[PDB]
Amino acid sequence: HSHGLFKKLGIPGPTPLPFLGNILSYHKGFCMFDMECHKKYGKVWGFYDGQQPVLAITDPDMIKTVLVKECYSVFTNRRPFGPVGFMKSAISIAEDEEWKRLRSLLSPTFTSGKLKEMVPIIAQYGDVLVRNLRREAETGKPVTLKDVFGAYSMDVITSTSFGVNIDSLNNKKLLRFDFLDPFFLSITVFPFLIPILEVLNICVFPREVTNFLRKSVKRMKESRLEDDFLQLMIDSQHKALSDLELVAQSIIFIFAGYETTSSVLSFIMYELATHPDVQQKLQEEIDAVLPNKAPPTYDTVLQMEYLDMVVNETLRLFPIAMRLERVCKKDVEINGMFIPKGVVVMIPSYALHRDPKYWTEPEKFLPERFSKKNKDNIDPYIYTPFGSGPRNCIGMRFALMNMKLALIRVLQNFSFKPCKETQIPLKLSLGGLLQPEKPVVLKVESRD
Amino acid sequence: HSHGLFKKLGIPGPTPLPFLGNILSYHKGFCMFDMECHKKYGKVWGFYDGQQPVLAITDPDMIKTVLVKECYSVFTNRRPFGPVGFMKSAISIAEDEEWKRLRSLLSPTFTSGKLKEMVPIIAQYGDVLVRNLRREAETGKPVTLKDVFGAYSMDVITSTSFGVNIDSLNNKKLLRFDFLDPFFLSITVFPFLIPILEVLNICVFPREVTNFLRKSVKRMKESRLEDDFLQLMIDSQHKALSDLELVAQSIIFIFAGYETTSSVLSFIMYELATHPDVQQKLQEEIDAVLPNKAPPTYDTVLQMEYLDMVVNETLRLFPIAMRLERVCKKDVEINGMFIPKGVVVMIPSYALHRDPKYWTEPEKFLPERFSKKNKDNIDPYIYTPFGSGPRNCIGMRFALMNMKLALIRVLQNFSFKPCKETQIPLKLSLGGLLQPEKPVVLKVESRD
Ligand code: HEM
Ligand code: HEM
Ligand SMILES: CC(C)(C)OC(=O)N[C@H](CS[C@H](Cc1ccccc1)C(=O)NCCCc1ccncc1)Cc1ccccc1
Numbered sequence: 001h002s003h004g005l006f007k008k009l010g011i012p013g014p015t016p017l018p019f020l021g022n023i024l025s026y027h028k029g030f031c032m033f034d035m036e037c038h039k040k041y042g043k044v045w046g047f048y049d050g051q052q053p054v055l056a057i058t059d060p061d062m063i064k065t066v067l068v069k070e071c072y073s074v075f076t077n078r079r080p081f082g083p084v085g086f087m088k089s090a091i092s093i094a095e096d097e098e099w100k101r102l103r104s105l106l107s108p109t110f111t112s113g114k115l116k117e118m119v120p121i122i123a124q125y126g127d128v129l130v131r132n133l134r135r136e137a138e139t140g141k142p143v144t145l146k147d148v149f150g151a152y153s154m155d156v157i158t159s160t161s162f163g164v165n166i167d168s169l170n171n172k173k174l175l176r177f178d179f180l181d182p183f184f185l186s187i188t189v190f191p192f193l194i195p196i197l198e199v200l201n202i203c204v205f206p207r208e209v210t211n212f213l214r215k216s217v218k219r220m221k222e223s224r225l226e227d228d229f230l231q232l233m234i235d236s237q238h239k240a241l242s243d244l245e246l247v248a249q250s251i252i253f254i255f256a257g258y259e260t261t262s263s264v265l266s267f268i269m270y271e272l273a274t275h276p277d278v279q280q281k282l283q284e285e286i287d288a289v290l291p292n293k294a295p296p297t298y299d300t301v302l303q304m305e306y307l308d309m310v311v312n313e314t315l316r317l318f319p320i321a322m323r324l325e326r327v328c329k330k331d332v333e334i335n336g337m338f339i340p341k342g343v344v345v346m347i348p349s350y351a352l353h354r355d356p357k358y359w360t361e362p363e364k365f366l367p368e369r370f371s372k373k374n375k376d377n378i379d380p381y382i383y384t385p386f387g388s389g390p391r392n393c394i395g396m397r398f399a400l401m402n403m404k405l406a407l408i409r410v411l412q413n414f415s416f417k418p419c420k421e422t423q424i425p426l427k428l429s430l431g432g433l434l435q436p437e438k439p440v441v442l443k444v445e446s447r448d
Numbered sequence: 449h450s451h452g453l454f455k456k457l458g459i460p461g462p463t464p465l466p467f468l469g470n471i472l473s474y475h476k477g478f479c480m481f482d483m484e485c486h487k488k489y490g491k492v493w494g495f496y497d498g499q500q501p502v503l504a505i506t507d508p509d510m511i512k513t514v515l516v517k518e519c520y521s522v523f524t525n526r527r528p529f530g531p532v533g534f535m536k537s538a539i540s541i542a543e544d545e546e547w548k549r550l551r552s553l554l555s556p557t558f559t560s561g562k563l564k565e566m567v568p569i570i571a572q573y574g575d576v577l578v579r580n581l582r583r584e585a586e587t588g589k590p591v592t593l594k595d596v597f598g599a600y601s602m603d604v605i606t607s608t609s610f611g612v613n614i615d616s617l618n619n620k621k622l623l624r625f626d627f628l629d630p631f632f633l634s635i636t637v638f639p640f641l642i643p644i645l646e647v648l649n650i651c652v653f654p655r656e657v658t659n660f661l662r663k664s665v666k667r668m669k670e671s672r673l674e675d676d677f678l679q680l681m682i683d684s685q686h687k688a689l690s691d692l693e694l695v696a697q698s699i700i701f702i703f704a705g706y707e708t709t710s711s712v713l714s715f716i717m718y719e720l721a722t723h724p725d726v727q728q729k730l731q732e733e734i735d736a737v738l739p740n741k742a743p744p745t746y747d748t749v750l751q752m753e754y755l756d757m758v759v760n761e762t763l764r765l766f767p768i769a770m771r772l773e774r775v776c777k778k779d780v781e782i783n784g785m786f787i788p789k790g791v792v793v794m795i796p797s798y799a800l801h802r803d804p805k806y807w808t809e810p811e812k813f814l815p816e817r818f819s820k821k822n823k824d825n826i827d828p829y830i831y832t833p834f835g836s837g838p839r840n841c842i843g844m845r846f847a848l849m850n851m852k853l854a855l856i857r858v859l860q861n862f863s864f865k866p867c868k869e870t871q872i873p874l875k876l877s878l879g880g881l882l883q884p885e886k887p888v889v890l891k892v893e894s895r896d
């Protein structure tokens with residue numbers, strides 16, 4: 001059917017198989033397939049997720065046109081995701097004017113003024129992260145980073161999104177997901193089954209958690225009325241937000257701020273343990289700005305420059321999105337290249353972050369790439385850990401502030417050393433998520 | 449799922465059943481269901497074709513806003529039809545800028561200057577219609593109107609669309625369709641199966657005819673290059689038309705000009721036979737304008753006023769579209785009524801044409817409603833046999849000219865009387881097409 005589009009347009013790419021397209025090349029993950037296609041075919045190439053044509057671009061001027069210049073007009077929505085059910089009103093799922101309305105309603109929620117008000121409350125669970133670390137560290141027992149950071153990320157969420165205060169590591173009925181099973185694999189081969197499962201109410205998000213958070217929010221709403229992100233959205237309610245839409249955005253913010261904050265913190269501490277010099281220099285900067293283990297503030301976090309260099313370099317090596325995608329809604333020609341309607345434009349963030357033509361020794365962990373001297377030579381359309389344009393990461397400021405507050409309190413009291421069971425070097429999962437194959441385990445030693 | 453929309457909006461309508469919606473009310477046809485809903489619920493009502501909300505409107509100002517004022521912005525496309533395959537490029541199927549491009553490319557094709565050039569060639573098969581009628585009339589054998597008019601309509605088509613000259617009644621491999629089977633009935637209950645059959649290449653139009661017309665056109669193109677509608681589209685080729693798009697429009701024009709011209713001519717001659725006074729007055733006007741059986745011309749057809757009154761009154765009683773539909777693509781509020789996105793706005797043409805509040809004795813056949821005195825009192829948004837707005841019938845001029853040329857030549861030589869087997873009164877098919885239940889049979893007598 002559509003497997004002759006890139007052939008007609010003169011765009012190179014791997015020859016697709018019937019029905020499957022090029023999905024069999026995903027046997028080593030999205031990352032390895034994007035790196036091989038960038039090496040084999042060059043600046044632009046095309047492939048097929050089954051019958052769906054996917055056009056990959058790597059030109060920074062062409063990336064700017066898709067993500068920024070022609071966002072509202074052509075490249076407004078990501079690829080259609082389903083079955084989603086009521087979560088269609090989710091901001092990361094909504095399309096066209098529905099998204100542009102939800103984006104404006106949730107934009108003042110993620111301002112620096114609202115983020116600074118969260119810091120003193122967020123700084124409470126940094127202490128919870130230390131005392132729980134103190135137990136597992138005081139004993140000579142290696143610590144799984146995904147469990148200790150996953151508990152902290154959930155603690156920040158339940159407090160910053162609903163005011164719920166829980167020590168999740170020691171104490172809550174939020175049930176998890178899975179994101180790499182024969183499921184989506186099949187949905188890619190059979191996208192015609194999406195409207196099938198929608199009328200069956202078969203939601204990729206299991207009803208019982210949505211029902212829980214729906215009734216949990218309505219209990220909080222009518223308890224505060226009359227007598228966090230929830231209150232910022234209650235005060236917000238472009239006709240005002242709906243109750244079913246409000247819980248849907250929470251459900252996004254529950255997953256976004258949880259799994260992504262836990263993974264990056266695990267990737268950062270893996271690099272700090274395998275690079276003791278970077279860990280020591282970061283501890284010296286934290287001690288210089290915050291002497292006597294001073295509690296970090298919103299202003300002191302933005303003052304640490306080497307801390308920002310460590311976070312940015314880690315996101316370069318591990319961009320958890322991997323790819324940035326937009327759906328071409330109208331026949332357009334950008335930067336001298338015609339793009340038909342319906343083609344999914346893709347930006348290989350992982351491949352561009354490790355491109356030797358833009359980075360010297362791209363596989364190495366060198367925070368000095370993001371120094372105040374060298375940060376000017378970084379193209380913001382090649383280094384996109386938070387995307388770019390009107391539909392970039394809306395929680396970029398919150399995520400960078402949440403991770404740095406955790407790193408400061410953790411490095412103020414502990415040093416992290418590799419173990420025997422520590423996977424060195426870290427091998428990324430061959431699946432569809434940017435996560436370690438084996439969980440990162442490290443030895444935690446107290447600075448006292 | 450969606451069965452609580454009209455309840456939330458305060459819009460009356462029949463209570464829908466799960467999955468089915470209100471499709472079980474179609475057991476007596478679209479026409480009877482639209483008349484009952486207009487009587488029970490009033491000016492506006494809503495129902496569900498399965499899970500699809502359909503909002504019906506009858507206000508002429510509100511109909512003008514949907515069909516004309518907000519056509520390009522909101523109400524641009526009809527309800528999604530499939531599986532269609534390559535016929536997606538069909539003008540009556542295309543959507544948004546693809547349709548607006550095809551509409552502009554095919555608009556000069558249907559001008560009065562191009563229609564007048566077709567008349568002397570079209571007038572050839574009016575004589576074929578008489579001599580073939582002369583055989584079946586010279587013998588005392590009643591004649592089925594759908595067979596004699598269906599042959600004439602196909603004769604005009606193959607000549608005006610490809611230059612092919614055939615006496616189809618006596619002499620062509622165009623295979624037919626069916627439009628009311630458990631098929632669409634099921635597609636309405638299960639619209640999620642449309643993308644299923646699309647990837648299977650299961651086309652509602654069977655491949656072998658499309659393959660025939662595709663290769664037949666390419667034989668005609670390269671025979672005229674270098675040494676009708678086809679040539680008007682060849683000369684036309686908004687980037688120029690495609691070869692696969694060109695045959696697709698022909699396929700539309702094959703069905704549109706065939707079944708619709710045969711049905712209306714059968715409805716007109718049924719009324720003329722059951723109303724001998726109208727038939728005599730029409731014969732007197734034709735003889736006055738064209739004495740001695742003068743061949744009709746483009747200018748003489750527009751000169752006959754009582755002929756236009758007969759055609760317009762018949763289209764009032766039998767509007768073959770029955771309904772006019774538009775898909776609401778954006779949340780809008782027109783004439784003080786909010787319409788959500790995705791709702792199919794429907795205009796019950798059959799119910800409005802037989803509304804006693806707009807027509808005196810609506811069931812009766814009275815051509816005097818369209819006299820030059822009374823035609824001014826007719827609201828063009830209540831009487832819509834050809835629709836209204838930018839997406840109205842593009843072949844309205846050709847259809848009115850083709851039917852009148854047939855009626856003139858037929859009434860110049862023959863008089864039509866009812867038989868014993870003639871269904872009086874004519875009962876419309878309880879299906880989804882505006883067609884007679886039993887075929888119209890009449891006695892044909894020569895005026896000589
Ligand atoms: C290290 C942490 C994070 C990284 C690297 C990250 C990165 C990204 C990226 C690359 C995108 C897509 C941008 C695009 O398509 O142009 C995105 C979207 C998004 N992110 Fe984040 N993110 C992080 C954490 C968070 C957090 C804490 C939130 C909290 C609300 C969040 C909320 C969102 C939302 C709602 C979207 C979709 C925005 C839209 O569709 O308009 N993310 N993120
Ligand atoms: C008695 C004869 C005919 C009647 C009563 C009739 C009526 C109609 C109506 C009511 C519509 C829909 C208008 C709307 O949705 O607003 C339509 C559409 C259309 N008709 Fe006709 N029609 C007739 C014959 C023809 C003929 C001879 C052609 C030859 C090409 C034709 C071509 C079309 C096309 C292409 C469309 C779709 C236009 C678009 O989607 O932009 N029709 N017709
Ligand atoms: C991975 C794959 C390619 C298969 O599909 C997607 O990517 N999933 C999303 C759409 S489902 C999900 C909803 C949800 C809610 C509650 C629990 C579970 C799931 C969501 O909304 N976000 C999940 C990504 C995590 C993230 C969020 C923000 N920031 C950074 C990372 C679309 C998307 C596309 C590009 C970037 C981010 C999200």
Ligand SMILES: CC(C)(C)OC(=O)N[C@H](CS[C@H](Cc1ccccc1)C(=O)NCCCc1ccncc1)Cc1ccccc1
Nearest residue numbers: 526529540625627632653699700702703704708768769841
């Ligand atoms: C009836 C139903 C509600 C189920 O679906 C539609 O209505 N079918 C069309 C879309 S399929 C068809 C394509 C085709 C081509 C070759 C052979 C067979 C079929 C088409 O293009 N036309 C067919 C109507 C005849 C007509 C054409 C012009 N003028 C007047 C009448 C959409 C449509 C909607 C409103 C009015 C007209 C057409």
